[PDB]
Amino acid sequence: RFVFPEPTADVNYIVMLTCAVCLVTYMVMAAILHKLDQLDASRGRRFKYEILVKTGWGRGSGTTAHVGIMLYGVDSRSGHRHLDGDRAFHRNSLDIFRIATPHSLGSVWKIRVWHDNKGLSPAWFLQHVIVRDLQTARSAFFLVNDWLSVETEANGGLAALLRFRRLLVAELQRGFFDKHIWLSIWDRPPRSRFTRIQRATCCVLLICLFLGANAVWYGAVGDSAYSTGHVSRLSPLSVDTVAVGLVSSVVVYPVYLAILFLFRSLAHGLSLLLVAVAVAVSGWVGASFPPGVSVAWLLSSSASFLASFLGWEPLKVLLFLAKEEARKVKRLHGMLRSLLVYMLFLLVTLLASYGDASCHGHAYRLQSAIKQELHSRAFLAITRSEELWPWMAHVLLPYVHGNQSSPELGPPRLRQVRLQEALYPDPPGPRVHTCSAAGGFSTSDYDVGWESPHNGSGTWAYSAPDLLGAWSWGSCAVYDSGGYVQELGLSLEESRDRLRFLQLHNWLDNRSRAVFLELTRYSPAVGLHAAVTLRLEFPAAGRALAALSVRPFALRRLSAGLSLPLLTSVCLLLFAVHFAVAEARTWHREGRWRVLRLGAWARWLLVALTAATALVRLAQLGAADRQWTRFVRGRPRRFTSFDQVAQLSSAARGLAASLLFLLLVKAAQQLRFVRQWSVFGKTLCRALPELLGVTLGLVVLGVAYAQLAILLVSSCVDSLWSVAQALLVLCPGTGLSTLCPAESWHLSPLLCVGLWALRLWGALRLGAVILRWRYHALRGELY
Amino acid sequence: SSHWGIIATYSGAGYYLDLSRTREETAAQVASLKKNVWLDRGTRATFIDFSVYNANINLFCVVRLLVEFPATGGVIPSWQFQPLKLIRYVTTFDFFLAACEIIFCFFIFYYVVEEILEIRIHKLHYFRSFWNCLDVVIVVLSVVAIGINIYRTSNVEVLLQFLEDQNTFPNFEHLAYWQIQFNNIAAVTVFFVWIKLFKFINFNRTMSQLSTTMSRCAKDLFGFAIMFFIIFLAYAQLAYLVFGTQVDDFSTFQECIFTQFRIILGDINFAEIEEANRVLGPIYFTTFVFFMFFILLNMFLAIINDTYSEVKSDLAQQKAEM
Amino acid sequence: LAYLVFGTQVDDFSTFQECIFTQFRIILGDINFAEIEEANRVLGPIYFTTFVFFMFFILLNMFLAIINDTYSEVKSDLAQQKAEM
Amino acid sequence: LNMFLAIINDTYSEVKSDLAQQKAEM
Amino acid sequence: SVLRELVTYLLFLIVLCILTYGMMSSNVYYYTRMMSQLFLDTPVSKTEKTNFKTLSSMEDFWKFTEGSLLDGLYWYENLLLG
Ligand SMILES: CCCCCCCC(=O)OC[C@H](COP(=O)([O-])O)OC(=O)CCCCCCC
């Protein structure tokens, strides 16, 4: 019933990323927990008011011992205590004094106090440790003066009471969260041998065991019905995903129980080896996973963890400095919960971005091949509007009907824009035209040749633009999806006849705003589609400039079911809503005048980025589904372009990359919590205006020098004079168009600025002059 | 055996053909292969192997040419020329090299014995020095090199089989592979042996204070280098995700890292990075250059200068006040 | 190390003095890096990246730090000598 | 080329110290 | 009084910037480059692959004089000044 997995596929990143994230968060949480434990290992071992908290009238009703008081409340309780002074627990001593106990209980009848039976049974008559109102009045001044048996827990409110209605209910708040290990890493009471690191090891052991067992069950057990594709769909059937996680948790429960009972040493190494081998097994089995069973494995692991957290552990239990230590431990707990939330967000983002990194290598080779077998050089090097037809008749046509790899998936199309405003040739001039002479765009219908409507509508109709998918963008303007269309034919022989008919019937010479040839390709070996777009723009009659775009993408459809992109998108929406509501609450707690300081501007950016990523991914899925449904209906009748899907996929990938970059930067700046490593970032914050001033001065100096150079260079042709001597201090060889060509100079001047900063990088060393000084000041005061 | 080409790792099996000794026979064979079509759409890799001797010097040469046909279309060529020496003992210099080899073996044995003897008796921790991890690294590398040499020079049976029948293809690829591995290991070992010289350059107050400064600032440099590398990898992954499918220089993560390191040197061409993306293209380059040259490069100088200043000042104060 | 690794394919490391000159030219950033990538896919890029990191970030700043400290100390000593007549 | 930076750094330190000491009593 | 003497300097600077824009956008560089290519880069005669920029002998100069020089000199179109 067990099958050795085969070395199929190449590799799976989902399981590896999940295991790496779990190990990293475990290591960071272990570091934090050790920092807290060493703080509360040797040390740390409104309820109190100004009422008579002692009763010293007893005669022979005391002994040298201690006492304790346990109370419950709304997510708050108390514990034992031991205090003494100079009287050394005098007989019936009236000690009306309270220490900074953690007894943050409420105004409820939940309290039980008892002393130590040092010697014989004491029948002392002590009223109570009365407390009425000091800061919040969490108790009531109601003393009963009731006595119990020897060291027996005296009843109280706000000597043989041994019944399961009360004896067992004591553990409902005493050992409740002391053993619910998942929600107990920050509930460790003193006088216990837990160390708060054994809990972390047990938790990471449980997580790794769940992951490994689920990976084994999906990737090795396939002898019943192969447990894949037949009925175990990736979509939740409600009887398979839970039915494997619950069973996995039940089977793996005893090995965790053994280690827990051993703890309750050398078990650290045993648990480390066990989690290491489990992770290795999960990674080895991970290679044999199609995406559907991969998301099924993710959901099964989540279900098993939830079942362990909520189903088994709750039923497992049924078998000077003091005013700042509390603040520091509260800060540590906040750090822990924020770290857990951030690691969950980082895992979701990593799965959203690098979910399919195998196609990222194949897409590059596919687009390179499509360019090299389309003769991109021969297309980008055409300027007139009469070599288009020979280029198509010689290159493209043998590529469409030329049966080879990368099948066609739909006939090509040629759509033209008329502009109705026939252009005039211009004098040679410096060219570099922005083709602004365009006016309106033609919309009427025309017959064969051009305008001559005899009977009804023209044979060359406008074919009004589609609502979704347009705006190729270009030098002249931003186009759309409309234009006069020609289908170029189906067979190779008739295609040549159509091409020559368009040649000799006055089609492209006169008006011709654009040509807009477009294609699509399919690669089933890697399962990738490709959108190919070829465009020639005619700024003036007899002149053209070329553009080529090959966009490889993957056709992910919304109707496919519970895809990984869908899950990542819904998780990102949930995270964005959580961040937005938290920020809105915190902002409302301060009202107006919060727009000051970057603190409130780093949250809106994150929320907007997350929302944009999720919405763009959802839009891409919907557009892909709509386009596929449109295309499937009739193949040899329509083009059904896929450019919008490619653009949406590119935008979603860019947004995910930007979000991951921001998360990595945030992780980088959270390294300050080491005492000696907190200086660095601090200096970067304390020396910022100096860097701004240096940058402004350098920009002004560069502007002055650039003006000097531009005025000097544009004088005449080579004469070997002093002007070129002074201008030769830059741009390699007494002038190289400021090191970026003029055609590239009127294209994103920020890039040229960056290039010139890179070339003259010795000026930036001036910044060091500032930074060093600051580092000598900030570091000199911490000591 | 396997090859580990560029697209993937290729097996040692397939459909092979041994060519002939004369040109006419080989031409006829290749023409017959081309006529009855041999490279169809199903082909994925092609290998050509041969070898030459060049008897003037004593040095064989093994030539292997590989052509990869990816499933997405195209052709990727690669080559591998390797010079070997399998008839070592010919001249006097060969005997001198053999003597040096056995001397090296004796030296390695001596170092191993010293290491074991010193680790056994005292200093059972032994790893808080950084001058003992270098010793174990050097010993391990030299032992691995000696083992590879022993397993490589004694497995020259293929030469004996070839020399008794010179009308058959000689298999020299394993020897070339192990020669490359031995060369890499020897280069790393000699580099580390040279680095080990820093233990002995302490003969005056000028050299002692520089070593003290370096050892004292190593910790802070590592602490800041963690953040530096986190930012570096963030930029690398952003570039890989955005430009990775169009630029031919961000196609792989390691290629992105190397491209960034070349950008530091000023060895970048802006045309391709810009035409791949009108927006987010210039932003990436400009922000990377600015935050790498104006901030990260100067913080290292700040740390190093502060450490050197404090070290020099405290030695000077201690010496002048004793 | 570069001589022993690339000393038979790259003709910038074909001789020891040529290796030294190529290493000096690497600092100026006028080396292709295309040949040394294909000469050895592993341990080739490692050498380049490690060399760049240790030259630009650890050894230039040390020269600058030494010069800074010495110049400041000299100015302080000269000012004390001149202002205490 | 590393000696211009020494002069600039030293002058910056002197100017900052002078401004800090002048501001203390004013 | 600094603010008053600021606006005059900014007005002077903007006037100088307008003059600079007028100077640099005179589009004279294109004409010089075009006619330089017309006279220099043009081969002497199509039978010989040589031009003025790569002259090597006295006979090459003689070919250039009765050749590319006489072609470009007597033809966008230029008018001789004597
Ligand atoms: C204004 C001309 C700036 C061009 C500097 C030359 C470019 C350059 O690479 O020199 C930077 C230099 C560090 O040495 P290096 O970078 O040349 O290897 O660092 C320096 O020596 C900085 C000195 C410049 C400071 C003077 C500014 C008034």
Side-chain angles (χ1 to χ4, degrees), chain A residues 759-763 765-766, chain C residues 27 60, chain D residues 1-2 4-5 8:
Chain A
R759 174 162 186 92
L760 302 156
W761 68 266
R765 298 289 277 170
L766 288 160
Chain C
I27 281 163
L60 190 74
Chain D
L1 292 171
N2 283 335
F4 297 97
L5 282 154
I8 298 175

Side-chain angles (χ1 to χ4, degrees), chain A residues 16 205 229 673 692 695:
Chain A
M16 182 179 72
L205 171 76
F673 286 113
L692 269 296
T695 312

